């Protein structure tokens, strides 16, 4: 499982996985682990998908209740401290759940908060969740820079992952992108992990002691 | 077999009601019909309308 | 008039009557008229539908409960809205736990307890509407009357609200016809025409305005309005 | 039976002041007069019992001067019955901050709860509310000596002098010519019990008939000391003053 | 079924003090006279107590109640109240009073319980005060020998002498210049029948006559002996023949 | 404890006790706000009459909810300790669940609710009483005041006058502020709302408080040398 | 007492006959709907210049496709508004679905049944339904554009044009003559600003009239102060013909 | 959790053209005790059902109270019992299988299985189970607890299917179960000889044969037997 | 100490054409050795056709498929009589299904049918009650055997368009009603000898605009 985000100039970049297992045999190979809270904010998938689907979909019902009676977007400081208490009243239940809840307001700049099952609340510019959380830590931490053109932070978030995926046995499928604006969270499209793969090996010549 | 828990006075004052009606309808002769109509005005509530709240 | 009592529900007059009764069944005549026929394989509901002014569409007076079962809302709407959620509720429960459709008898008697339970005791406004209650069963076709005190009857027709008398006065004529017409849609629904108009009187009928529903062996609760009607005139 | 019959004290007044609340203050000034007279260094408290059978032993029985605790008295005036429950609820009140934070409650706070379950009788309790007022005589360090009195409204305000009971006008002018901002402690000793027995109908108010307390910082180390004077303390300074 | 009352039945009068306190109170005045004199040694409680029926049994009236060992009580005004009252005052005292302390509670104390009870039978709504006044007559270390007299306002206070019920003005009096600073047991119980006499004239039987000290303690009484620094029952409640004696030595 | 209907609608269609609500604010001494662009500047007066009243320890209307936010009032001085206390507790709330301090609409619409809660219960009797709320939105030097009704009802406003004799009040500010541009500074809106405050109050300086917020959580007391200052100015307009 | 238990001698509810006053009181509301919008056109109160004219709202939006107008007791309307916000998200959780205007309609008057006298099937905390009407709008697909008008009797009317508060009267007289199917957007418009000078006790201005619409390509939307203008001097130079 | 004690084992059934037959032993084993003896448990409800009850008796009791219950509220309000408001085994069957589920969420399900068989008004053969856990199914031939795994078998080969329903007649389901409570008795520790056959038909009502007694045994082979190694 | 949950077996196979949508479940009913029925279906059409399987223990099936019949009734009273929508349908199981989470009910629930523009849709619920749309999802026991036989061919996943090894597979193509029986069958067979629990009987529910379409095809008995 890899899934992260992380700050720079232009904005945040989201970029996560798709495979998910029930045993050990991928029961199915496509998964959305981008929840649309609403349509500015987006939270990761990890863990029980059921804890999180029905928690963020939740979360989602208080951003419209917010929206209405204050008319005014709702923080992102806000949003992740609600998810917070709630996890910790309900915690010991089973519920598995990580999840970086990402926004991009003027009245903050760009943000990221990691939230556990256990209730914590870690404000951060560099986020990872998973089995291949070491890995993706690694690369990223490395060719980390704030000062960056959203290109080249969308490329490198690529990268990262690919890196990552070969070497985690639980992250593969496909890879979607985003890079989160102002004005909320614009989609940069799905690419196979796969096809990508072919990609780099090639461009770069990474990926040459791997005989693809 | 309409009328019901009515006494004296008031039987009497529906078929007083129905020759108003006759005579405002201008009829000759007063109409089963308009009987009807004063047992619904000798009663307290008014009579027949559309709805509008019930 | 006000005087005996109605603010307290317990207490009763010297003869023994409840004033509150009373005014529920005058709340009757002020809304809709419904009449209501059956024959031994069908059962028939002729809802006249009706508005506040004509910029207002018309609004549905029989509120289908059921494939099998309906009622028809006269005296107090607001009433009307409880006692059919709640009874959606039991038709589930009784099918569910016994496999056994909630026969229209019972379920008139169920209904019963409800109203007499808010006036025996303070607290609680006597639900005021009457309610046609039919019904298609294996026993055949049903229509029992609920009055607003709490008591149920099979009949084999009836009409409510005002003016109700002259619908009476044709069906009752007319009761042998209809019972011995069987396995005739038609037929009936061209009687029940009939009966409302004796009520109606410096009244209109519009084909849109009327309303009607049947029941039966081979058909579910279906509703039948505008064009479809225009047969049955 | 039930639903006929009303004796709701919870309509609101058309007048803005609730009726029932009105009659309890009538009912304050047939019990006696208890004065409450700040000063610097303390605050001297004294009240004159109402009853004055002889049969009845009055000299054991204290009913309107308790102590709470070390920096807090109270002085009663009203039902003795609803005032008793108030006592207990005072008391626990004060022992449960204390308990929490490790400092004696300040006093604003104390009075402040106390005065809000008054108002709550009337607000939607049902209840007929409690007819009594009482005058907390209170320090903290903070603040100094701090004087509150409450009202059957569930209301308090602060005074450097108040009276209730009787006679709340009679008391309150006399304090108002003779009691000076900067006079001390021992001043109002003498001032309080000479004023009292001019406004009474007795010839001398007895000893007997009296009950004195002090709250003051004046007691040495930086410790704060009160007494319930009893009975017989009371008469010889009742001698020295000239009332006997 | 609750009583849809959800206030206070019980309304200040509009010239203050409560129309229902003063209701009750007459109840304990109409009822039957009952005196008590404090004493050093004991107390001495009196009641009138005659035949409702000649054929009605006259020993099992009782207007005598235990609260603890050491304490009883009696009252005027009105019977079934009373005796629930003692019901209810029995758990206030023992449980809870075992639970935090274990012993008998001094009567000061126990006093003081019964008075919010009966404040907050008024205060509710659905309940009617209790009325009746009790003397509760007692005995605790530390205040020797105690009478307080418990009104049905939800008031004590403790008194040398007092009387309620309609020969209490008439008693009252009788008593005060009779009354002395050092009381013989033997002269408390004299001077208490003399006056008793008054309050009604004739049946001086000790049957129809109930009379009860908070004497001197007794390992007798306690019916064990066999450690005698225990204390006895402070409280005993005389024969007819004790009575008896009595009116022979006044 | 109660709960039994007293929102029995007249045929007039109004609740009774709302009514009655009314009359009681009235009847409360005035406060009176007018906001500059760069103040909330807040008038009251005060009992401090009695010669024996130590007015250290007489509590003070003005309120504080929040660093950044204050009430006043008009209306039962029973009742409004009650309000205080709620206010208090929601301000809190917000830090707490939400994240930063109440944003200053959101507690205006929380004592809202509270009077709303009171006439959809039968049992509970509004508050007869009236608030003027005065504050800085988060983040945000932008001044607010606000105004409220026992009833339930709340609206912003440029100048207000609650509690006695709000007609000769009103009139003056019809006159002295024009809402298409506020007063400059703070020392130019000290001097109007002094001037209304002393039509009804009659002189005084000792009895009179007024509370100066500013931006930036700044709350500071007006010395009553400070007072006498501007009544000193005036008393030259109305000579000339 | 006169309880919702006890009934009038004809057998209304006391409490519907009351609450048609209150409504008269409050403030006039006109809507009339079309295929092409529904516009709302609301009487905005002011009694000084001093009261600041943007704070206060009389169309309140419910939910992004769903607007409001209000009119009755406002304070029980404040609340009664409050509830219908909580209606439409609990809805949207369940279906991942916009609430129909008409399912909406009907899940508001049964909030507002329920009292204070004490059921025994039901939550009593109330004392009455609110006597209070509010006309519903908004759009979906089924209905396609709609305006719903409930009534404090537990009665829901649909309308093609229907006006409540001080001018209802008058208002609706002309409101069945000039209602038409033909009417589009800009048409709607301009009418309710006439018919609102009218019934307005002083001068018709965009700074006490306050528009809305919903649509369902911005869902509810509240127009700007210069469109509003803008279709008030259009209608000026038409009336100085005459 | 019930312990279960007393326990009842095999209820064995078969369909035919025109009803059904059920059939059970009676015995209220104890483990190795056969503390209780003649336990029927095969109990009439009307002409149109038996409910052949197995599984822990003390349970068995508690269940018998519904069946008990359930007969007295259809009877209730209406008069009618021609076969209107009469019961059927499919009301009866899902009557039980509601509440026994409701036990078993609880993590304290109610201890039996239970067949339900009977004929329905218009004449359908009706056998259906339902046990603790409440897995309901229709199924042509049934047998419960050890029965399972030696009758359904036995009665499988006479109708192994759903269009051998009709072509069974009631002479040769009658001669299948004889067989089968003689191989039950041999092989099965807990089954006695004795039997209660019950013959639920729509044409002829209910024909309840007590203590049938199979009393004719093989033991001709044990004596050719001597040996042993 | 009574077991959490027993189980039912079976195995079913959920297949999204284009316009329709087809499951197909076999009809056996099994648990340990002994075949608990020959011919029950497991594959009901509830309403508005949707068809649902919740396969695994067929015991808390039972109650499922009750309480989501139940709401199908009341989708009509919420929308004016409007068509349920397979995505509105899906987040309804999804509440009861999280509700016994913490007693855990063992299914693999799909459910079929139609969507806005007509199409096909198959969306597959995890035990715990997460459901996700897929383009062919099998559940069940023998869930695993079925579904990349599915994947390869229909999909044409690394089914190499000739000359573009490597690179280019072969274009996918329309599925047709036809096409979708033959191949359900096939997988049906494949499954009946390698896995005991698959056999007997196949009872195919296809679900068409027009309505439910029954059609049964014979498994080996042995």
Same mark, same amino acid.
């Given at each position: ?212 | ?14 078929? @007083? &009601? ?10 000759? !002769? /007063?109409?089963?019909?308009?009987? @009807? &109509? ?10 027949? !309308? /559309?709805?509008?709240?019930? | ?233 | ?244 | ?250 | ?240 | ?242 | ?229 | ?222």
């Amino acid at each position: 499982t890899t899934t992260l985000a992380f700050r720079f100039q232009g904005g945040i970049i989201v970029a996560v996985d798709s495979r998910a297992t029930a045993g050990n045999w991928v029961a199915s190979q496509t998964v959305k682990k981008v929840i649309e809270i609403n349509p500015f904010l987006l939270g990761t998938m990890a863990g029980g998908a059921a804890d999180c689907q029905f928690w963020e979909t939740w979360l989602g019902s208080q951003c419209r209740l917010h929206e209405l009676r204050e008319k005014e977007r709702i923080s992102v400081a806000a949003a992740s401290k609600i998810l917070s208490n709630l996890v910790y009243q309900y915690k010991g239940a089973g519920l598995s759940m990580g999840t970086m809840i990402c926004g991009y307001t003027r009245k903050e700049g760009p943000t990221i908060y990691y939230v556990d099952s256990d209730g914590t609340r870690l404000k951060g510019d560099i986020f990872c969740v998973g089995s291949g959380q070491t890995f993706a830590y690694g690369v990223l931490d490395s060719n980390y820079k704030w000062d960056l053109s959203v290109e080249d932070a969308l490329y490198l978030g690529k990268r990262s992952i690919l890196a990552a995926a070969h070497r985690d046995a639980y992250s593969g499928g496909s890879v979607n992108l985003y890079h989160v604006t102002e004005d909320g969270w614009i989609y940069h499209g799905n690419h196979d992990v796969g096809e990508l793969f072919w990609k780099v090996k090639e461009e770069e010549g990474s990926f040459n002691n791997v005989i693809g | 077999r309409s009328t019901d828990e009515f006494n004296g006075a008031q039987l009497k004052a529906v078929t @007083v &009601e129905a020759g108003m009606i006759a005579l405002r309808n201008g009829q000759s !002769s /007063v109409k089963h019909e308009d009987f @009807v &109509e004063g047992i619904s005005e000798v009663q307290a509530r008014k009579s027949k !309308s /559309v709805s509008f709240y019930a | 008039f006000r005087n005996n009592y109605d603010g307290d529900t317990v207490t009763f007059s010297p003869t023994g009557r409840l004033f509150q009764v009373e005014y529920a069944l005058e709340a009757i005549k002020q809304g809709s008229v419904t009449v209501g026929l059956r024959s031994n394989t069908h059962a028939v509901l002729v809802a006249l539908k009706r508005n506040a002014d004509e910029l207002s569409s018309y609004q549905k007076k029989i509120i289908k409960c059921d494939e099998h079962m309906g009622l028809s809302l006269a005296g107090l709407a607001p009433d009307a809205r409880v006692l059919s959620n709640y009874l959606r509720q039991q038709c589930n429960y009784s099918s569910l736990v016994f496999n056994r459709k909630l026969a229209v008898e019972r379920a008139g008697h169920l209904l019963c307890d409800k109203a007499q339970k808010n006036t025996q005791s303070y607290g609680g406004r006597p639900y005021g509407v009457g309610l046609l209650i039919i019904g298609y069963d294996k026993s055949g076709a049903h229509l029992l009357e609920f009055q607003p005190s709490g008591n149920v009857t099979e009949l084999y027709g009836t009409a409510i609200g005002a003016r109700s008398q002259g619908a009476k006065t044709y069906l009752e004529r007319t009761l042998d016809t209809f019972i011995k017409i069987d396995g005739n849609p038609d037929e009936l629904i061209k009687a029940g025409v009939e009966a409302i108009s004796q009520s109606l009187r410096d009244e209109s009928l519009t084909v849109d305005n009327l309303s009607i529903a049947i029941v039966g062996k081979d058909t579910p609760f279906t509703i039948y309005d505008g064009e479809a009607v225009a047969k049955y005139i | 039976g039930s639903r006929r019959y009303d004796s709701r004290t919870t309509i609101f007044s058309p007048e803005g002041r609730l009726y029932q609340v009105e009659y309890a203050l009538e009912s304050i000034s047939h019990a006696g007069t208890a004065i409450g007279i700040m000063a610097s260094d303390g605050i001297v408290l004294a009240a004159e019992r109402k009853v004055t059978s002889t049969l009845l032993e009055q000299d054991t029985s204290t009913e309107k001067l308790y102590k709470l605790n070390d920096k807090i008295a109270v002085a009663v005036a009203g039902l003795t019955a609803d005032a008793e429950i108030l006592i207990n609820t005072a008391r626990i009140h004060a022992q449960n901050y204390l308990k929490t934070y490790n400092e004696d409650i300040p006093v604003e706070i104390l009075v402040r709860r106390l005065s809000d379950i008054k108002q709550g009788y009337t607000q939607h309790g049902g209840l007929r509310p409690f007819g009594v007022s009482f005058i907390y005589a209170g320090y903290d360090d903070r603040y100094g000596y701090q004087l509150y009195t409450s009202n059957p409204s569930g209301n308090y305000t602060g005074w450097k002098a108040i009276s209730v009971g009787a006679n709340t006008s009679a008391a309150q002018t006399l304090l108002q010519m003779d009691y000076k901002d900067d006079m001390k402690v021992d001043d109002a000793i003498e001032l309080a019990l000479k004023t009292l027995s001019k406004t009474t109908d007795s010839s001398a108010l007895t000893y007997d008939r009296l009950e004195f307390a002090t709250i003051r910082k004046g007691a040495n180390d930086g410790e704060v000391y009160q007494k319930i004077f009893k009975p017989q303390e009371i008469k010889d300074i009742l001698v020295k003053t000239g009332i006997t | 079924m609750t009583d849809r009352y959800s206030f206070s039945l019980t309304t200040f009068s509009p010239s203050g003090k409560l129309g229902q306190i003063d209701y009750a109170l007459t109840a304990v005045k109409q009822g039957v006279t009952s005196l008590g004199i404090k004493a050093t040694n004991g107390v001495v409680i009196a009641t009138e107590k005659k035949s409702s029926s000649p054929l009605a049994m006259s020993e099992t009236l009782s207007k005598v109640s235990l609260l603890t060992p050491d304490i009883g009580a009696v009252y005027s005004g009105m019977g079934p109240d009373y005796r629930v009252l003692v019901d209810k005052s029995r758990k206030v005292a023992h449980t809870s009073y075992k639970r935090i302390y274990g012993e008998y509670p001094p009567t000061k104390l126990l006093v003081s319980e019964v008075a919010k009870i009966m404040q907050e039978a008024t205060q509710s709504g659905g309940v009617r005060p209790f009325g009746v006044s009790l003397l509760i007559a007692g005995h605790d270390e530390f205040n020797g020998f105690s009478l307080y007299q418990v009104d049905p306002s939800g008031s004590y206070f403790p008194w040398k002498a007092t009387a309620i019920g309609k020969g209490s003005v008439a008693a009252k009096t009788f008593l005060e210049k009779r009354w002395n600073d050092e009381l013989e047991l033997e002269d408390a119980i004299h001077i208490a029948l003399l006056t008793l006499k008054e309050s009604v004239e004739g049946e001086f039987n000790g049957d129809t006559i109930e009379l009860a000290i908070i004497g001197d303690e007794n390992p007798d009484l306690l019916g064990y002996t066999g450690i005698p620094t225990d204390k006895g029952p402070r409280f005993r409640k005389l024969t007819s023949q004790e009575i008896n004696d009595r009116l022979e030595a006044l | 404890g109660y709960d039994r209907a007293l929102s029995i609608f007249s045929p007039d269609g109004h609740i009774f006790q709302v009514e009655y609500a009314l009359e009681a604010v009235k009847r409360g001494t005035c406060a009176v706000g007018v906001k500059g662009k760069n103040c909330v500047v807040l008038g009251c007066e005060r009992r401090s009459t009695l010669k024996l009243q130590d007015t250290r320890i007489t509590p003070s209307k003005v309120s504080k909810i929040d660093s950044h936010v204050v009430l006043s009032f008009s209306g039962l001085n029973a009742d409004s300790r009650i309000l205080i206390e709620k206010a208090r507790v929601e301000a809190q709330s917000h830090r707490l669940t939400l994240e930063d301090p109440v944003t200053v609409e959101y507690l205006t619409r929380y004592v809202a609710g509270v009077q709303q809660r009171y006439t959809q219960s039968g049992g509970v009797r509004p508050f007869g009483v009236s608030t003027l709320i005065a504050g800085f939105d988060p983040r945000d030097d932008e001044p607010k005041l606000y105004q409220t009704e026992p009833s339930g009802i709340y609206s912003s406003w440029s100048a207000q006058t609650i509690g006695r004799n709000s007609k000769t009040v009103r009139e003056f500010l019809e006159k002295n502020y024009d809402r298409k541009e506020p007063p400059a500074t703070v020392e130019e809106c000290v001097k109007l709302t002094v001037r209304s405050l002393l039509e009804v109050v009659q002189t005084g300086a000792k009895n009179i408080e007024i509370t100066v917020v500013k931006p930036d959580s700044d709350i500071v007391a007006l010395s009553s040398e400070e007072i006498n200052q501007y009544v000193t100015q005036i008393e030259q307009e109305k000579q000339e | 007492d006169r309880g919702v238990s006890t009934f009038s001698p004809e057998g209304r509810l006391f409490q519907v006959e009351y609450s048609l006053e209150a409504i008269k009181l409050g403030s006039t509301a006109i809507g009339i709907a079309t295929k092409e919008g529904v516009v709302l056109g609301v009487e905005k109160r002011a009694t000084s210049p001093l009261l600041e004219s943007d704070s206060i709202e009389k169309i309140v939006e419910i939910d992004r496709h769903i607007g409001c107008a209000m009119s009755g007791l406002t304070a029980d309307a404040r609340s009664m508004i409050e509830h219908a916000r909580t209606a439409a998200v609990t809805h949207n959780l369940y279906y991942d679905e916009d609430i129909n205007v008409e399912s909406l309609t009907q899940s508001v008057c049964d909030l507002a049944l329920r009292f204070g006298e004490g059921a025994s099937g039901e939550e009593r905390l109330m004392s009455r339904p609110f006597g209070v009407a509010l006309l519903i709008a908004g759009h979906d697909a089924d209905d396609g554009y709609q305006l719903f008008h409930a009534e404090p009797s537990g009665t829901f009317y649909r309308y093609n044009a229907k006006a409540i508060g001080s001018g209802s009267e008058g208002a609706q007289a002309e409101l069945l003559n000039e209602w038409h199917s033909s009417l589009t957007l800009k048409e709607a418009e301009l009418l309710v600003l006439k018919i609102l000078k009218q019934v307005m006790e002083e001068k018709l201005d965009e700074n006490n009239a306050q528009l809305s619409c919903i649509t369902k390509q911005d869902g509810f939307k509240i127009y700007d102060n210069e469109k509003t203008a803008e279709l008030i001097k259009e209608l000026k130079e038409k009336e100085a013909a005459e | 959790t019930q312990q279960p004690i007393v326990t009842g084992t095999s209820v064995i059934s078969m369909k035919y053209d025109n009803g059904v037959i059920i059939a059970a032993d009676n015995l209220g084993s104890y483990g190795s005790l056969l503390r209780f003896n003649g336990v029927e448990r095969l109990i009439p409800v009307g002409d149109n059902t038996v409910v052949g009850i197995s599984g822990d008796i003390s349970d068995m009791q508690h269940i018998e109270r519904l069946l008990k219950d359930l007969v007295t509220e259809n009877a209730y309000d209406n008069p009618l019992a021609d076969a209107e408001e009469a019961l059927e085994p499919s009301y009866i069957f899902e009557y039980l299988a509601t509440v026994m589920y409701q036990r078993r969420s609880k993590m304290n399900p109610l201890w039996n299985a239970i067949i339900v068989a009977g004929v329905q008004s218009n004449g359908d053969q009706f056998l259906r189970y339902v046990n603790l856990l409440g897995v309901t199914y229709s199924s042509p031939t049934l047998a419960t607890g050890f029965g399972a795994h030696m009758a359904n078998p036995l009665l499988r080969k006479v109708v192994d299917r759903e269009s051998d329903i009709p072509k069974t007649t009631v002479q040769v389901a009658e001669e299948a179960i004889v067989n089968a409570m003689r191989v039950l008795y041999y092989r099965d520790a807990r089954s006695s000889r004795n039997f209660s056959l019950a013959i639920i038909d729509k044409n002829t009502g209910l024909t309840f044969k007590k203590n049938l007694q199979v009393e004719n045994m093989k033991w001709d082979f044990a004596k050719d037997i001597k040996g042993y190694g | 100490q009574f077991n959490p949950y027993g189980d039912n077996g079976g195995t079913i196979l959920g297949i999204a054409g284009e316009d329709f949508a087809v499951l197909a479940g076999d009809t056996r009913n099994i648990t340990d050795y002994s075949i608990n029925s020959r011919y029950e279906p497991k594959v009901f059409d509830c309403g508005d056709n949707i068809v649902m399987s919740a396969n695994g223990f067929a015991a808390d099936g039972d109650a499922l498929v009750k309480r989501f019949k139940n709401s199908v009734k009341w989708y009509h009273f919420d929308h004016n009589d409007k068509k349920l929508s397979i995505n509105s349908a899906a987040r309804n199981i999804q509440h009861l299904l999280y509700g016994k989470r913490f007693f855990p009910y063992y299914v693999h629930t799909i459910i079929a049918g139609l969507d806005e523009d007509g199409k096909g849709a198959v969306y597959s619920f995890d035990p715990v009650g997460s459901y996700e749309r897929e383009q062919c999802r099998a559940g069940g026991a023998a869930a695993s055997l079925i579904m990349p036989f599915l994947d390869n061919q229909v999909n044409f996943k690394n089914q190499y368009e000739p000359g573009t090894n490597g690179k280019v597979k072969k274009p996918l193509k329309y599925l047709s009603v036809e096409e979708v029986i033959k191949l359900v069958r096939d997988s049906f067979t494949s499954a009946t000898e390698r896995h005991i629990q698959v056999g007997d009987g196949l009872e195919i529910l296809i679900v068409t605009k027009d309505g439910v379409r029954k059609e049964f095809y014979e498994l080996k008995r042995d």
